[PDB]
Amino acid sequence: NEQEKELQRRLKRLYPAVDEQETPLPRSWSPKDKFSYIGLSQNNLRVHYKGHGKTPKDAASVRATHPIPAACGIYYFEVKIVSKGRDGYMGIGLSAQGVNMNRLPGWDKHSYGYHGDDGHSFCSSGTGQPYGPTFTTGDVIGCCVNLINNTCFYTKNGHSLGIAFTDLPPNLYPTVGLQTPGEVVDANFGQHPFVFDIEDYMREW
């Protein structure tokens, strides 16, 4: 078992008020809390699509092991697109517990998503809205939840896109969703420095 001193260090530096004893920080994807078409690797940081991929009914999401602790104040995580696979039907965001995993983040109630194929944002519905630019292989996509003013914004390659959602519900799980064969994404939950200057943004708070 790796000690992961760097991860722990960053976690303590970013979220010093969080006592993992009561609200543990999400450190990886959940092998239980996912859809069967999703396969995990790299200590559950890498997500692989391995299903049919015929229609939207083949969409598969994964949640983190734990929901974002309120004590974070502000929370951040990043996803590196290892491969867009076929169509790059990839969603990054947040979903409440027990939200259906047979879809992409944002489609269901209490689910929120930024998709790579169209750059759209999905605030609790199958219908999306023009939010940012499309992303694919090579790109890093970030997701920042402000637990103080109840807002969320994404980042692309170190650069903030706008606020995407306001008035978010509590106890949200970082989620990633795939749908096309060949799609592969890596999460950064604090293991590595982030591309976006998260600490600068936090300093305004």
Short mmCIF file of all heavy atoms in Angstrom, two decimals, residues 29-87:
data_model
loop_
_atom_site.label_atom_id
_atom_site.label_comp_id
_atom_site.label_asym_id
_atom_site.label_seq_id
_atom_site.Cartn_x
_atom_site.Cartn_y
_atom_site.Cartn_z
N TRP A 29 -12.19 6.79 -8.07
CA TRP A 29 -13.49 6.30 -8.50
C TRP A 29 -13.92 5.11 -7.67
O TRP A 29 -13.08 4.43 -7.07
CB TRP A 29 -13.44 5.91 -9.98
CG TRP A 29 -13.08 7.08 -10.81
CD1 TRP A 29 -11.96 7.24 -11.57
CD2 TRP A 29 -13.81 8.30 -10.92
NE1 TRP A 29 -11.96 8.48 -12.16
CE2 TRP A 29 -13.10 9.15 -11.77
CE3 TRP A 29 -15.02 8.76 -10.37
CZ2 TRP A 29 -13.54 10.42 -12.10
CZ3 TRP A 29 -15.46 10.02 -10.69
CH2 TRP A 29 -14.72 10.84 -11.55
N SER A 30 -15.23 4.88 -7.63
CA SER A 30 -15.79 3.78 -6.87
C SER A 30 -15.99 2.56 -7.77
O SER A 30 -16.66 2.65 -8.80
CB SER A 30 -17.13 4.18 -6.27
OG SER A 30 -17.78 3.05 -5.71
N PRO A 31 -15.40 1.41 -7.38
CA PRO A 31 -15.59 0.15 -8.12
C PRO A 31 -17.00 -0.41 -7.94
O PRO A 31 -17.46 -1.19 -8.76
CB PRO A 31 -14.56 -0.80 -7.49
CG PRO A 31 -13.60 0.07 -6.75
CD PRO A 31 -14.40 1.27 -6.31
N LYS A 32 -17.69 -0.02 -6.87
CA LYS A 32 -19.07 -0.43 -6.65
C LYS A 32 -20.07 0.47 -7.38
O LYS A 32 -20.94 -0.01 -8.11
CB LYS A 32 -19.39 -0.44 -5.15
CG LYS A 32 -20.88 -0.40 -4.82
CD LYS A 32 -21.49 -1.80 -4.65
CE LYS A 32 -22.98 -1.74 -4.29
NZ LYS A 32 -23.82 -1.25 -5.43
N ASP A 33 -19.91 1.78 -7.17
CA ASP A 33 -20.86 2.80 -7.62
C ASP A 33 -20.59 3.24 -9.06
O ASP A 33 -20.17 4.37 -9.31
CB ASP A 33 -20.78 4.00 -6.68
CG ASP A 33 -22.00 4.89 -6.76
OD1 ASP A 33 -22.95 4.56 -7.51
OD2 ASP A 33 -22.01 5.94 -6.07
N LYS A 34 -20.82 2.33 -9.99
CA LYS A 34 -20.63 2.59 -11.42
C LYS A 34 -21.56 1.70 -12.23
O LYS A 34 -22.27 0.85 -11.67
CB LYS A 34 -19.17 2.33 -11.84
CG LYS A 34 -18.76 0.87 -11.89
CD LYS A 34 -17.36 0.73 -12.49
CE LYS A 34 -16.74 -0.64 -12.24
NZ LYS A 34 -17.44 -1.76 -12.93
N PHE A 35 -21.55 1.91 -13.54
CA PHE A 35 -22.34 1.10 -14.44
C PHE A 35 -21.43 0.05 -15.04
O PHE A 35 -20.23 0.26 -15.16
CB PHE A 35 -22.96 1.96 -15.53
CG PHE A 35 -24.23 1.40 -16.09
CD1 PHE A 35 -25.40 1.41 -15.35
CD2 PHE A 35 -24.25 0.85 -17.37
CE1 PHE A 35 -26.57 0.87 -15.86
CE2 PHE A 35 -25.42 0.32 -17.89
CZ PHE A 35 -26.58 0.33 -17.14
N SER A 36 -22.00 -1.09 -15.40
CA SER A 36 -21.20 -2.23 -15.83
C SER A 36 -20.31 -1.96 -17.06
O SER A 36 -19.23 -2.56 -17.19
CB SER A 36 -22.10 -3.46 -16.04
OG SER A 36 -23.41 -3.07 -16.42
N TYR A 37 -20.73 -1.05 -17.94
CA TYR A 37 -19.96 -0.72 -19.14
C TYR A 37 -18.68 0.06 -18.83
O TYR A 37 -17.89 0.34 -19.73
CB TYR A 37 -20.79 0.09 -20.12
CG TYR A 37 -22.09 -0.54 -20.53
CD1 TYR A 37 -23.19 0.24 -20.84
CD2 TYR A 37 -22.22 -1.92 -20.62
CE1 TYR A 37 -24.39 -0.32 -21.21
CE2 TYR A 37 -23.42 -2.50 -21.00
CZ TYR A 37 -24.51 -1.69 -21.29
OH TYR A 37 -25.72 -2.25 -21.67
N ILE A 38 -18.49 0.42 -17.56
CA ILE A 38 -17.30 1.14 -17.13
C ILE A 38 -16.29 0.20 -16.50
O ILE A 38 -16.64 -0.57 -15.60
CB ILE A 38 -17.64 2.22 -16.08
CG1 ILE A 38 -18.37 3.39 -16.73
CG2 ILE A 38 -16.37 2.73 -15.42
CD1 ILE A 38 -17.66 3.96 -17.94
N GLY A 39 -15.04 0.25 -16.95
CA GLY A 39 -13.97 -0.50 -16.32
C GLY A 39 -12.91 0.44 -15.77
O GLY A 39 -12.58 1.44 -16.41
N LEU A 40 -12.38 0.12 -14.58
CA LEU A 40 -11.41 0.98 -13.88
C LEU A 40 -10.00 0.41 -13.89
O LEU A 40 -9.82 -0.80 -13.91
CB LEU A 40 -11.81 1.18 -12.42
CG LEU A 40 -13.09 1.93 -12.10
CD1 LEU A 40 -13.25 2.01 -10.60
CD2 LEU A 40 -13.04 3.32 -12.71
N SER A 41 -9.01 1.29 -13.82
CA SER A 41 -7.61 0.87 -13.70
C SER A 41 -6.79 2.00 -13.07
O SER A 41 -7.34 3.04 -12.74
CB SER A 41 -7.05 0.46 -15.06
OG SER A 41 -7.06 1.54 -15.98
N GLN A 42 -5.48 1.79 -12.92
CA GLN A 42 -4.58 2.76 -12.27
C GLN A 42 -5.08 3.17 -10.89
O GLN A 42 -5.31 4.35 -10.65
CB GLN A 42 -4.38 4.02 -13.11
CG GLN A 42 -4.26 3.77 -14.59
CD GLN A 42 -2.95 3.13 -14.96
OE1 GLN A 42 -1.88 3.59 -14.55
NE2 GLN A 42 -3.02 2.04 -15.73
N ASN A 43 -5.25 2.19 -10.00
CA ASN A 43 -5.71 2.45 -8.64
C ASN A 43 -7.05 3.16 -8.59
O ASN A 43 -7.33 3.96 -7.68
CB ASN A 43 -4.65 3.22 -7.85
CG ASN A 43 -3.41 2.38 -7.55
OD1 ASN A 43 -3.51 1.19 -7.23
ND2 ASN A 43 -2.24 3.00 -7.68
N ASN A 44 -7.88 2.85 -9.59
CA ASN A 44 -9.20 3.43 -9.77
C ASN A 44 -9.20 4.91 -10.11
O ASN A 44 -10.15 5.63 -9.77
CB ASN A 44 -10.10 3.16 -8.56
CG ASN A 44 -10.29 1.68 -8.29
OD1 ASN A 44 -10.21 0.85 -9.20
ND2 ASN A 44 -10.55 1.34 -7.03
N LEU A 45 -8.16 5.38 -10.79
CA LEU A 45 -8.16 6.74 -11.30
C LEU A 45 -8.47 6.77 -12.80
O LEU A 45 -8.96 7.78 -13.31
CB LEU A 45 -6.84 7.46 -10.99
CG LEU A 45 -6.46 7.51 -9.51
CD1 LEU A 45 -5.11 8.16 -9.35
CD2 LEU A 45 -7.50 8.25 -8.69
N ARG A 46 -8.21 5.67 -13.51
CA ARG A 46 -8.50 5.63 -14.95
C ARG A 46 -9.81 4.94 -15.28
O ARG A 46 -10.07 3.83 -14.84
CB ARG A 46 -7.36 4.97 -15.71
CG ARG A 46 -7.63 4.85 -17.19
CD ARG A 46 -6.36 4.48 -17.93
NE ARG A 46 -5.37 5.55 -17.89
CZ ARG A 46 -4.26 5.58 -18.61
NH1 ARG A 46 -3.99 4.58 -19.44
NH2 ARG A 46 -3.41 6.59 -18.52
N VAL A 47 -10.63 5.62 -16.08
CA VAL A 47 -11.92 5.08 -16.46
C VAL A 47 -11.91 4.69 -17.94
O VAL A 47 -11.51 5.48 -18.79
CB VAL A 47 -13.03 6.10 -16.17
CG1 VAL A 47 -14.38 5.58 -16.62
CG2 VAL A 47 -13.06 6.42 -14.70
N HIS A 48 -12.31 3.45 -18.23
CA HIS A 48 -12.33 2.91 -19.60
C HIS A 48 -13.76 2.57 -20.02
O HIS A 48 -14.49 1.93 -19.27
CB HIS A 48 -11.52 1.62 -19.71
CG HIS A 48 -10.11 1.71 -19.21
ND1 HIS A 48 -9.01 1.58 -20.03
CD2 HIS A 48 -9.62 1.87 -17.95
CE1 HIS A 48 -7.90 1.69 -19.31
NE2 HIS A 48 -8.24 1.86 -18.05
N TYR A 49 -14.15 2.97 -21.23
CA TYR A 49 -15.42 2.51 -21.79
C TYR A 49 -15.22 1.18 -22.49
O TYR A 49 -14.32 1.04 -23.32
CB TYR A 49 -16.02 3.53 -22.76
CG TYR A 49 -17.43 3.15 -23.13
CD1 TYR A 49 -18.48 3.48 -22.28
CD2 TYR A 49 -17.70 2.45 -24.29
CE1 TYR A 49 -19.77 3.12 -22.59
CE2 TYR A 49 -19.00 2.09 -24.61
CZ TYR A 49 -20.02 2.43 -23.75
OH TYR A 49 -21.32 2.08 -24.05
N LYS A 50 -16.05 0.20 -22.16
CA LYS A 50 -15.88 -1.14 -22.71
C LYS A 50 -17.19 -1.83 -23.15
O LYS A 50 -17.27 -3.06 -23.16
CB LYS A 50 -15.12 -2.02 -21.72
CG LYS A 50 -15.72 -2.07 -20.32
CD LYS A 50 -14.92 -2.99 -19.39
CE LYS A 50 -15.69 -3.30 -18.11
NZ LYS A 50 -14.92 -4.14 -17.15
N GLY A 51 -18.19 -1.04 -23.54
CA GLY A 51 -19.50 -1.56 -23.91
C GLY A 51 -19.91 -1.45 -25.38
O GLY A 51 -19.09 -1.24 -26.28
N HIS A 52 -21.21 -1.61 -25.63
CA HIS A 52 -21.75 -1.54 -26.98
C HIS A 52 -21.48 -0.19 -27.62
O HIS A 52 -20.71 -0.09 -28.58
CB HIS A 52 -23.26 -1.83 -26.97
CG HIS A 52 -23.61 -3.21 -26.51
ND1 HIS A 52 -24.13 -4.16 -27.35
CD2 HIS A 52 -23.52 -3.80 -25.29
CE1 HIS A 52 -24.34 -5.28 -26.68
NE2 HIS A 52 -23.98 -5.08 -25.42
N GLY A 53 -22.13 0.85 -27.10
CA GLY A 53 -21.96 2.19 -27.63
C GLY A 53 -22.80 2.42 -28.87
O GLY A 53 -22.41 3.15 -29.77
N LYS A 54 -23.97 1.78 -28.91
CA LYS A 54 -24.87 1.91 -30.05
C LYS A 54 -25.70 3.19 -29.97
O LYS A 54 -25.79 3.94 -30.94
CB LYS A 54 -25.80 0.70 -30.14
CG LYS A 54 -25.24 -0.44 -30.97
CD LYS A 54 -24.41 -1.39 -30.12
CE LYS A 54 -23.46 -2.21 -30.98
NZ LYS A 54 -24.16 -2.87 -32.11
N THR A 55 -26.29 3.44 -28.80
CA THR A 55 -27.11 4.62 -28.59
C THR A 55 -26.84 5.25 -27.23
O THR A 55 -25.99 4.78 -26.48
CB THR A 55 -28.61 4.30 -28.71
OG1 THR A 55 -29.12 3.94 -27.42
CG2 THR A 55 -28.83 3.14 -29.68
N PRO A 56 -27.58 6.31 -26.92
CA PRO A 56 -27.44 7.00 -25.63
C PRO A 56 -27.78 6.07 -24.47
O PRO A 56 -27.38 6.35 -23.33
CB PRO A 56 -28.47 8.12 -25.73
CG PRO A 56 -28.54 8.43 -27.18
CD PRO A 56 -28.33 7.12 -27.90
N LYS A 57 -28.50 4.99 -24.75
CA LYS A 57 -28.86 4.03 -23.73
C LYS A 57 -27.68 3.14 -23.37
O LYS A 57 -27.81 2.16 -22.64
CB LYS A 57 -30.04 3.17 -24.20
CG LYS A 57 -31.26 3.97 -24.61
CD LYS A 57 -32.53 3.15 -24.46
CE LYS A 57 -33.77 4.03 -24.58
NZ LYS A 57 -35.00 3.32 -24.15
N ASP A 58 -26.50 3.50 -23.89
CA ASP A 58 -25.28 2.76 -23.61
C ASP A 58 -24.29 3.63 -22.84
O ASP A 58 -23.12 3.27 -22.69
CB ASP A 58 -24.66 2.24 -24.90
CG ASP A 58 -25.37 1.02 -25.45
OD1 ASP A 58 -25.47 0.01 -24.71
OD2 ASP A 58 -25.84 1.07 -26.60
N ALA A 59 -24.77 4.78 -22.38
CA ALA A 59 -23.96 5.70 -21.59
C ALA A 59 -23.67 5.14 -20.19
O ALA A 59 -24.56 4.60 -19.53
CB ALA A 59 -24.65 7.07 -21.49
N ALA A 60 -22.42 5.26 -19.74
CA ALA A 60 -22.05 4.72 -18.43
C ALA A 60 -21.24 5.72 -17.59
O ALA A 60 -20.22 6.25 -18.03
CB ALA A 60 -21.29 3.41 -18.58
N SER A 61 -21.71 5.98 -16.37
CA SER A 61 -21.03 6.90 -15.47
C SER A 61 -20.43 6.20 -14.25
O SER A 61 -20.81 5.09 -13.89
CB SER A 61 -21.99 7.98 -15.00
OG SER A 61 -22.24 8.90 -16.03
N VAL A 62 -19.49 6.88 -13.61
CA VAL A 62 -18.92 6.41 -12.37
C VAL A 62 -18.92 7.57 -11.35
O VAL A 62 -18.76 8.73 -11.72
CB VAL A 62 -17.51 5.86 -12.60
CG1 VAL A 62 -16.67 6.87 -13.38
CG2 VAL A 62 -16.85 5.46 -11.28
N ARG A 63 -19.17 7.26 -10.08
CA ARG A 63 -19.09 8.26 -9.02
C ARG A 63 -17.78 8.07 -8.25
O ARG A 63 -17.17 7.01 -8.31
CB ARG A 63 -20.27 8.14 -8.06
CG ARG A 63 -21.47 9.00 -8.42
CD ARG A 63 -22.56 8.88 -7.36
NE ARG A 63 -23.32 7.64 -7.49
CZ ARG A 63 -24.54 7.56 -8.02
NH1 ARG A 63 -25.15 8.66 -8.45
NH2 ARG A 63 -25.15 6.39 -8.10
N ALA A 64 -17.36 9.09 -7.53
CA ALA A 64 -16.21 8.96 -6.66
C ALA A 64 -16.62 8.12 -5.46
O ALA A 64 -17.81 7.92 -5.21
CB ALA A 64 -15.73 10.33 -6.21
N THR A 65 -15.63 7.63 -4.72
CA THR A 65 -15.88 6.86 -3.50
C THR A 65 -16.65 7.64 -2.44
O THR A 65 -17.35 7.06 -1.61
CB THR A 65 -14.57 6.46 -2.85
OG1 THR A 65 -13.77 7.64 -2.70
CG2 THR A 65 -13.83 5.48 -3.72
N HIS A 66 -16.51 8.96 -2.45
CA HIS A 66 -17.14 9.81 -1.45
C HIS A 66 -17.65 11.11 -2.02
O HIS A 66 -17.10 11.61 -2.99
CB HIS A 66 -16.17 10.10 -0.31
CG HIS A 66 -15.72 8.87 0.40
ND1 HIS A 66 -14.46 8.32 0.23
CD2 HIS A 66 -16.37 8.04 1.25
CE1 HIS A 66 -14.35 7.24 0.97
NE2 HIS A 66 -15.49 7.04 1.60
N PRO A 67 -18.71 11.66 -1.40
CA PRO A 67 -19.23 12.98 -1.77
C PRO A 67 -18.34 14.09 -1.23
O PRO A 67 -17.63 13.89 -0.24
CB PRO A 67 -20.59 13.03 -1.08
CG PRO A 67 -20.45 12.11 0.12
CD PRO A 67 -19.55 11.00 -0.38
N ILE A 68 -18.39 15.24 -1.88
CA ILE A 68 -17.58 16.38 -1.51
C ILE A 68 -17.97 16.87 -0.14
O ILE A 68 -19.13 17.22 0.08
CB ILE A 68 -17.77 17.54 -2.52
CG1 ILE A 68 -17.31 17.11 -3.91
CG2 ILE A 68 -17.03 18.80 -2.05
CD1 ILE A 68 -17.76 18.01 -5.01
N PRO A 69 -17.01 16.90 0.80
CA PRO A 69 -17.30 17.42 2.14
C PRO A 69 -17.59 18.92 2.10
O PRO A 69 -16.87 19.65 1.42
CB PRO A 69 -16.00 17.16 2.92
CG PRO A 69 -15.27 16.10 2.13
CD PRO A 69 -15.65 16.36 0.68
N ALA A 70 -18.63 19.35 2.82
CA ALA A 70 -18.96 20.77 2.89
C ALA A 70 -17.77 21.57 3.44
O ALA A 70 -17.53 22.72 3.04
CB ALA A 70 -20.17 20.98 3.75
N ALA A 71 -17.04 20.93 4.36
CA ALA A 71 -15.90 21.55 5.01
C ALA A 71 -14.79 21.92 4.02
O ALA A 71 -13.80 22.55 4.40
CB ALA A 71 -15.35 20.64 6.09
N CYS A 72 -14.94 21.52 2.76
CA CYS A 72 -13.98 21.90 1.75
C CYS A 72 -14.03 23.39 1.52
O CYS A 72 -13.01 24.00 1.23
CB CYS A 72 -14.23 21.19 0.42
SG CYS A 72 -13.67 19.48 0.40
N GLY A 73 -15.23 23.97 1.66
CA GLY A 73 -15.44 25.36 1.30
C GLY A 73 -15.52 25.48 -0.20
O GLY A 73 -16.58 25.72 -0.77
N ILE A 74 -14.38 25.31 -0.85
CA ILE A 74 -14.31 25.20 -2.30
C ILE A 74 -13.66 23.85 -2.62
O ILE A 74 -12.69 23.47 -1.97
CB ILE A 74 -13.51 26.36 -2.90
CG1 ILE A 74 -14.24 27.69 -2.67
CG2 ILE A 74 -13.26 26.12 -4.39
CD1 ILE A 74 -13.40 28.93 -2.93
N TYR A 75 -14.21 23.11 -3.59
CA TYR A 75 -13.63 21.83 -3.99
C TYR A 75 -13.22 21.82 -5.47
O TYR A 75 -13.87 22.43 -6.31
CB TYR A 75 -14.57 20.65 -3.67
CG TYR A 75 -13.98 19.31 -4.09
CD1 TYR A 75 -13.03 18.66 -3.30
CD2 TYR A 75 -14.35 18.72 -5.29
CE1 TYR A 75 -12.48 17.46 -3.69
CE2 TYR A 75 -13.81 17.52 -5.68
CZ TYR A 75 -12.87 16.90 -4.88
OH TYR A 75 -12.33 15.70 -5.29
N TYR A 76 -12.14 21.12 -5.78
CA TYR A 76 -11.69 21.04 -7.17
C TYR A 76 -11.21 19.63 -7.56
O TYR A 76 -10.68 18.89 -6.73
CB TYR A 76 -10.58 22.06 -7.40
CG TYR A 76 -10.22 22.26 -8.85
CD1 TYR A 76 -11.16 22.71 -9.77
CD2 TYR A 76 -8.93 22.01 -9.31
CE1 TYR A 76 -10.84 22.89 -11.10
CE2 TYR A 76 -8.60 22.19 -10.65
CZ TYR A 76 -9.56 22.63 -11.53
OH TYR A 76 -9.25 22.82 -12.85
N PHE A 77 -11.44 19.25 -8.81
CA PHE A 77 -10.83 18.04 -9.34
C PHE A 77 -10.66 18.20 -10.84
O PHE A 77 -11.31 19.07 -11.45
CB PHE A 77 -11.61 16.76 -8.96
CG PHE A 77 -12.87 16.52 -9.75
CD1 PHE A 77 -12.89 15.59 -10.80
CD2 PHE A 77 -14.06 17.16 -9.42
CE1 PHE A 77 -14.07 15.34 -11.52
CE2 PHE A 77 -15.25 16.91 -10.13
CZ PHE A 77 -15.25 16.00 -11.18
N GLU A 78 -9.75 17.42 -11.41
CA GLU A 78 -9.45 17.51 -12.84
C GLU A 78 -9.45 16.16 -13.52
O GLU A 78 -9.19 15.13 -12.90
CB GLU A 78 -8.11 18.24 -13.09
CG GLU A 78 -8.28 19.73 -13.32
CD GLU A 78 -6.96 20.47 -13.47
OE1 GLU A 78 -5.89 19.81 -13.40
OE2 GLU A 78 -6.98 21.70 -13.65
N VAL A 79 -9.79 16.17 -14.80
CA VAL A 79 -9.85 14.94 -15.57
C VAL A 79 -9.01 15.10 -16.82
O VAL A 79 -9.15 16.08 -17.56
CB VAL A 79 -11.30 14.61 -15.97
CG1 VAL A 79 -11.34 13.42 -16.93
CG2 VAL A 79 -12.15 14.35 -14.74
N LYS A 80 -8.12 14.16 -17.06
CA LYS A 80 -7.30 14.26 -18.25
C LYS A 80 -7.90 13.31 -19.25
O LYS A 80 -8.19 12.17 -18.91
CB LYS A 80 -5.84 13.91 -17.94
CG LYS A 80 -5.03 13.36 -19.11
CD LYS A 80 -4.58 14.45 -20.04
CE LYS A 80 -3.05 14.45 -20.17
NZ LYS A 80 -2.39 14.99 -18.95
N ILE A 81 -8.15 13.79 -20.47
CA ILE A 81 -8.69 12.95 -21.53
C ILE A 81 -7.57 12.15 -22.20
O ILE A 81 -6.85 12.68 -23.06
CB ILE A 81 -9.40 13.79 -22.63
CG1 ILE A 81 -10.37 14.80 -22.02
CG2 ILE A 81 -10.07 12.85 -23.67
CD1 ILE A 81 -11.65 14.20 -21.45
N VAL A 82 -7.43 10.89 -21.82
CA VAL A 82 -6.38 10.05 -22.38
C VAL A 82 -6.71 9.71 -23.84
O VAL A 82 -5.81 9.68 -24.68
CB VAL A 82 -6.16 8.76 -21.58
CG1 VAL A 82 -5.05 7.93 -22.20
CG2 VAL A 82 -5.83 9.09 -20.15
N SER A 83 -8.00 9.48 -24.11
CA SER A 83 -8.46 9.22 -25.48
C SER A 83 -9.95 9.47 -25.68
O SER A 83 -10.78 9.01 -24.90
CB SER A 83 -8.15 7.79 -25.90
OG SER A 83 -8.94 7.45 -27.02
N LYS A 84 -10.27 10.18 -26.76
CA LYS A 84 -11.66 10.48 -27.10
C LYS A 84 -12.38 9.27 -27.67
O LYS A 84 -13.57 9.33 -27.96
CB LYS A 84 -11.74 11.65 -28.09
CG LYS A 84 -11.50 11.29 -29.56
CD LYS A 84 -12.40 12.15 -30.46
CE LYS A 84 -12.18 11.90 -31.95
NZ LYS A 84 -12.48 10.50 -32.36
N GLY A 85 -11.65 8.17 -27.83
CA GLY A 85 -12.23 6.95 -28.36
C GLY A 85 -12.79 7.11 -29.76
O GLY A 85 -12.07 7.44 -30.70
N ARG A 86 -14.09 6.87 -29.90
CA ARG A 86 -14.76 6.97 -31.19
C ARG A 86 -15.38 8.34 -31.45
O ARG A 86 -14.94 9.06 -32.35
CB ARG A 86 -15.83 5.88 -31.31
CG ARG A 86 -15.84 5.17 -32.66
CD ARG A 86 -17.12 5.47 -33.42
NE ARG A 86 -18.28 5.54 -32.55
CZ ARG A 86 -18.95 4.48 -32.11
NH1 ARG A 86 -18.57 3.26 -32.46
NH2 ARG A 86 -20.00 4.64 -31.31
N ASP A 87 -16.40 8.68 -30.68
CA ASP A 87 -17.09 9.95 -30.86
C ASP A 87 -16.80 10.97 -29.75
O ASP A 87 -17.21 12.13 -29.85
CB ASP A 87 -18.60 9.72 -30.96
CG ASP A 87 -18.97 8.79 -32.10
OD1 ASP A 87 -18.69 9.13 -33.27
OD2 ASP A 87 -19.53 7.71 -31.83
#
